[PDB]
Design a protein around this ligand. Structure first.
Ligand SMILES: OC[C@H]1O[C@@H](O)[C@H](O)[C@@H](O)[C@H]1O
Ligand SMILES: [Ca+2]
Ligand SMILES: [Cs+]
Ligand SMILES: [Cs+]
Ligand SMILES: [Cs+]
Ligand SMILES: [K+]
Ligand SMILES: [K+]
Length: 603
């Protein structure tokens, strides 16, 4: 029970059990595969929950009940805390008890946050609830702003006690003050956002028979409050300062890991491997490693990462390599980046393709770039930023480095017997848009002719990393009209990625400071489980997630010509946006079970 130090530690370990909820980058997860970043084949809607959320068929009886999990571990935390109060000096010292209490405090707060960000106003559960508790005493939802204040206060208390950094020695990353402050930063940032700060779509949604101190039956603010941005800024600043001092965090900036691993610099159209281009090409590899390495490999950017892995086959091309037995190594090729993605990664000059005077006019984006032996490469895919070539892949281009028996795999997205659409051969699997991503793919990844393969060295799945803290501070400054300081916050991230810094001159009526911040966030944290939340908190669901917004190439036709393939094509699946989609529906049974609980609007 708590009959010994090792038993107690085991109990504490089990309290961390819910932290993988809504895991970033997991391809079947709705926070990953329902945004305008990329789409999955419509026929994959039978797998997981992503379909129900993308196509608005989620319901109180058809939903991902992560609430079940978060409050489960919240209860586990308070159960632990209860037993610990009765535990003697034989179990743990007073100093260690203090540490354990802080860890639980952080976990409870985080678990509430994980629930809040999906469900909106939630019941605050700050004790263990005995199963014989009368139904009349169940908490209902507390007003969003009440929830925010409590979570924030809990994180601040934990932060007083927890260490700022820990050495990574195993797969259990225990809480730090740095993580506590980072969570609070993202929390307040969300809270200051339009959805929760003046633009909630259902102003009249409220409690029926439950009161929040300070708010009565109200559940969400309907009035813009600038002070929320002020507090968010201070919180984001503090998180950044902590992380970069006693947190011992810094942006991954190693330009030579590829070299130490005996790899060639990557092929990039229009950027040959010559002396003058070394910096650009090394930046491409830097950005591949930045999101696929361990601290033991020199990465000090991760604030909170998990040992939990996510699947890669879903992003690999179809036929990878023919084995000596005549059979093929194959991927699923389902993770399909949209034209929105391909149009909002930057040009080499650090600008949007549409906006960049030095970039191809949109009228010519789908023409061949005329690259010898790679004529399939269209002009849109030439002249882009390092992050583009690091993380994206396209017809005529290379996928990976060691990928196919030690060589990069050239993509043939129009070939029905290689990487193109062909249900008779590949069943459900194909790129929906004619693009692919190789983000998170270890450069050492390699499939062998003799059979078997390697994915190099695994890396933690990232929950919080330092680049985000820069972006969070930038967004707060932007909201407050601090233009130079917003710029100052973005520039370390831009500089690391090998594109030009911003100046005041770049802020105009054609590209606002908010445009820059939001787009830098779109790019840097692409496929890291942010866009789902960011579009929602910005109250821009209809704009970005609505019907017909998602586009790609003409990729669901067999054996197309170059000309047939390279046409702007609406993704042909029943994507929609409706306002109820901002919030996750509450499990039917829970609404029934808790008399004080109210369903999300529209469900
Ligand atoms: O989730 C989609 C995937 O589902 C698997 O069960 C299948 O083996 C893959 O080919 C791919 O279709
Ligand atoms: Ca790796
Ligand atoms: Cs309003
Ligand atoms: Cs242009
Ligand atoms: Cs109810
Ligand atoms: K660490
Ligand atoms: K171009």
């Amino acid at each position: 029970a708590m009959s010994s130090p090792t038993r107690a530690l085991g109990f504490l370990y089990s309290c961390y059990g819910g932290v993988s909820t809504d895991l970033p980058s997991a391809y079947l997860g709705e926070i990953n595969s329902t945004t305008d970043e990329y789409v999955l084949p419509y026929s994959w809607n039978t797998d997981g929950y992503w379909g129900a959320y993308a196509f608005n068929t989620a319901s109180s009886t058809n939903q991902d009940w992560l609430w079940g999990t978060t409050y489960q571990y919240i209860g586990q935390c308070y159960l632990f805390l209860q037993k610990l109060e009765n535990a003697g000096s034989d179990i743990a010292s007073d100093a260690e008890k203090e540490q354990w209490r802080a860890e639980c405090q952080f976990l409870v707060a985080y678990y509430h946050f994980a629930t809040l960000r999906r469900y909106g106003p939630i019941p605050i559960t700050d004790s263990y609830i005995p199963m014989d508790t009368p139904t009349s005493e169940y908490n209902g939802r507390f007003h969003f702003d009440y929830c925010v204040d409590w979570i924030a206060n809990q994180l601040d208390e934990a932060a007083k006690v927890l260490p700022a950094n820990r050495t990574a020695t195993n797969e259990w990353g225990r809480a730090t003050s740095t993580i506590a402050k980072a969570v609070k930063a993202r929390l307040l940032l969300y809270a200051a956002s339009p959805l929760w700060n003046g633009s909630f779509p259902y102003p009249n949604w409220q409690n029926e028979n439950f009161e929040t101190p300070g708010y009565g039956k109200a559940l969400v603010s309907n009035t813009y409050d600038k002070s929320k941005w002020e507090r968010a800024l201070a919180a984001c600043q503090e998180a950044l300062t902590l992380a970069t001092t006693s947190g011992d965090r810094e942006l991954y900036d190693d330009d030579e890991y590829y070299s130490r691993q005996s790899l060639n610099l990557p092929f990039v159209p229009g950027v040959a491997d010559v002396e003058d281009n070394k910096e650009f090409l090394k930046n491409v590899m830097k950005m591949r490693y930045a999101v696929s390495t361990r601290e033991s490999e020199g990465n000090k950017e991760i604030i909170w990462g998990l040992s939990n892995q996510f699947d890669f086959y879903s992003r690999y091309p179809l036929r990878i390599l023919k084995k000596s037995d005549g059979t093929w190594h194959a991927g699923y090729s389902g993770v399909s980046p949209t034209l929105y993605t391909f149009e909002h990664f930057y040009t080499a000059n650090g600008k949007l393709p549409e906006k960049d005077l030095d970039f191809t006019p949109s009228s010519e984006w789908f023409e061949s770039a005329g690259i010898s032996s790679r004529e399939d490469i269209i002009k849109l895919n030439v002249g882009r930023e390092p992050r583009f070539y690091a993380w994206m892949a396209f017809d005529g281009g290379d996928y990976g480095t060691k990928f196919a028996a030690g060589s990069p795999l050239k993509l043939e997205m129009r070939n029905s017997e290689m990487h193109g659409y062909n249900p008779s051969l590949f069943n459900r699997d194909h790129s929906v848009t004619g693009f692919l991503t190789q983000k998170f793919v270890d450069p050492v990844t390699e499939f062998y002719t003799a059979g078997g393969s390697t994915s190099g060295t695994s890396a933690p799945t990232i929950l919080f990393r330092l680049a985000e803290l820069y972006l969070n501070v930038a967004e707060c400054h932007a909201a407050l009209g601090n233009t130079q300081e917003a710029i100052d916050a973005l520039n370390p991230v831009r500089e690391r990625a090998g594109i030009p810094k911003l100046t005041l001159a770049d802020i105009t009526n054609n590209m606002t400071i908010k445009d820059w911040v939001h787009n830098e966030r779109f790019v840097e944290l692409w496929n890291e489980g942010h866009r789902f939340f960011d579009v929602r908190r910005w109250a821009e669901g209809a704009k970005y997630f609505g019907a017909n917004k998602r586009e790609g190439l003409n990729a669901e036709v067999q054996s197309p010509t170059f000309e047939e393939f390279n046409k702007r094509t609406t993704v042909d699946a029943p994507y929609v946006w409706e306002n109820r989609m901002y919030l996750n529906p509450v499990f039917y049974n829970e609404v029934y079970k808790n008399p004080q609980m109210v369903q999300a609007p529209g469900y």
